[PDB]
Design a protein around this ligand. Structure first.
Ligand SMILES: COc1ccc(NC(=S)NCCCn2ccnc2)cc1OC
Ligand SMILES: [Cl-]
Ligand SMILES: [Zn+2]
Length: 302
């Protein structure tokens, strides 16, 4: 069921016009396309390419002066058996009291007998987050020292190896949510924003969670303001009784507020080899990446 979002949840863009104009003109299309190209390789957990993609993410952010921790652990999967998973946790201020967290998964789904590239799922999301760090590096500098800072979290082992279920899915997220819960490190997450299945044409977004509906409406407003300045995806509706499972689930279950940036319906190529370079709509990709960059600045800088 879709419900119209009530007025109480409206939360318009607050950046001054000049800063909104200035920040909305920051981009690096070439870097975004280069990041996509680097990441868009088969990258099943435990493979050489999986390590190559992790190294690229880690080095890219370390080169931009982010603190980067790799959370490594072993778990058992159907088919593959024992695997070494590696969540990537990048922060501007590793000593922050609070974080906005932007996140996605960097593994690609294991598909017997075929290469699966997972362009929308989630090579493009991963590239959008690296590109965000590159494009906004000047504006983000103060967040290296502030009490509220930014974390980019690249989950490992999101995908099932045999059949999606509670014991065969979201390996990295389940591990990390349990670890941080045990360590009292979940309360510091203001909100976990999860990007998934982005880069295909004509995505439609809805608000899934009432406690983040107001911040959903800030993204909606960012999109409206960009349109007005002539520079739609986010619907002003909430989807109730939606039970879409993803990396956020183990955080959601432990009281962490979630903003789930995933289109409904999913792209038509979902979990087929057609989720490749050819499905990427670059106009939609540049657009969504810009909207997300501005959302991050709205939240963090205000
Ligand atoms: C085909 O369209 C759908 C298919 C499945 C579901 N239901 C669930 S619970 N999906 C969890 C997806 C986990 N995931 C995310 C990226 N790679 C894997 C909903 C769909 O449309 C609303
Ligand atoms: Cl490989
Ligand atoms: Zn998937």
């Amino acid at each position: 069921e879709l419900v119209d979002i009530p007025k109480i949840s409206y939360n318009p863009s607050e950046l001054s016009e000049p800063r909104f104009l200035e920040y909305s003109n920051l981009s690096d299309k070439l870097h975004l396309r280069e990041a996509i190209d680097k990441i868009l390789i088969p990258r099943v957990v435990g493979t050489t390419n999986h390590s190559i993609v992790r190294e690229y993410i880690v080095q890219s952010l370390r080169d931009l002066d982010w603190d980067v921790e790799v959370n490594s652990f072993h778990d058992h999967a159907p088919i593959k058996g024992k695997l070494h998973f590696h969540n990537i946790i990048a922060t501007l201020n590793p000593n922050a009291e609070r974080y906005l967290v932007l996140s996605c998964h960097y593994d690609s789904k294991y598909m017997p007998g075929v290469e699966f590239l997972g362009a929308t799922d989630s090579a493009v999301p991963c590239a959008m987050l690296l590109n965000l760090a590159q494009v906004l590096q000047e504006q983000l500098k103060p967040l290296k020292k502030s009490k509220l800072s930014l974390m980019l979290l690249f989950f490992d082992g999101e995908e099932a190896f045999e059949e999606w279920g509670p014991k065969d899915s979201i390996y990295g997220a389940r591990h990390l949510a349990k670890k941080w819960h045990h360590e009292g490190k979940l309360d510091r997450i203001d909100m976990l924003v999860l990007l998934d299945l982005l880069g295909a044409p004509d995505p439609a977004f809805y608000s899934f969670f009432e406690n983040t509906e107001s911040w959903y409406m800030r993204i909606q407003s960012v999109e409206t303001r960009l349109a007005k300045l002539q520079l739609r995806y986010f619907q002003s509706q909430a989807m109730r009784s939606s039970f879409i499972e993803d990396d956020h689930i183990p955080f959601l279950r432990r009281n962490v507020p979630i903003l789930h940036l995933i289109p409904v319906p999913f792209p038509s190529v979902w979990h087929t080899p057609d989720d490749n370079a050819s499905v990427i709509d670059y106009a939609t990709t540049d657009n969504l990446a810009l909207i997300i960059r501005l959302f991050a600045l709205e939240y963090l800088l205000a």
